[PDB]
A paper describes a structure:
[name] causes life-threatening gastrointestinal infections. Herein, we report 30 X-ray structures from a structure genomics pipeline spanning 13 years, representing 10.2% of the X-ray structures for this important pathogen. The Center for Structural Biology of Infectious Diseases (CSBID, formerly the Center for Structural Genomics of Infectious Diseases) implemented a structural biology pipeline starting in 2010 through paired efforts with systems biology, bioinformatics, and other research specialists in [name] pathogenesis. This project ultimately involved 335 proteins linked with pathogenesis, metabolism, and antimicrobial resistance.
The structures presented here are part of the [name] 630, R20291, and Y384 sets nominated at CSBID.
Residue numbers in the entry: 292 to 461, 470 to 533, 543 to 561
Write the structure that this text describes.
Amino acid sequence: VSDTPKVTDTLIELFKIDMETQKDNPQGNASLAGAEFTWKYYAGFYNKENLPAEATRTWVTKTIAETDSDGTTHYITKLADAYKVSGDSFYMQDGKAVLPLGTLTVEETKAPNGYLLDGAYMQAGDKSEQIKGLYVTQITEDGDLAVLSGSNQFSVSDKVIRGGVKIQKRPQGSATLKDTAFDIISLNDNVVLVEGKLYKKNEVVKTIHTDIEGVASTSADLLPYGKFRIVESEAKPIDFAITENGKIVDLTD
């Protein structure tokens, strides 16, 4: 027979994954670790449409890599000290973070390095509803207990940053009018999805040819955040990075 308000330690675990591959691994040299989530607890019972302007407590947590007993690394965040970035103190009971009756909201507020926030969504299981933006649930009474409504686990899908690259070969037009082919190679420790196909380190992900101006170019979404090597396909190679979304890296000097 306790003497403290009704609370539950059964909260929510978020698993960060790559949206395009649906894998527990980042693409290129991006990360699934470091994604930040803002959690807000409210003393009342609200829905998304009538949340008060001020939360009762606010916490910012981040995804951290964890390898399970099967040897699989996941990128997990939840309401505990090991995942905390900033915010108020947690409600603690018997060495664990708990929540009293009320409303709980959570949304991704910082994409992990190499990813975008744009379009990120949560999923409780396979085929279930894709939740975009702010997720809202409550801690409600069930007999003498406090219970969190809805799923206890979600996958959080993040869109990887993508970019492109353009280049030239090194009379008049005797160099630019030649048919110069360039191979683009992955220098990444993780797979890269390029034109519907997965490529590993040192594999050629694309070949591009020079136009009548002498410029070989890719689309602005060909390559995920990552390190790449561009070399004439016959030969002095160039290493470059994709970091800004939709930007064509300019190697034409």
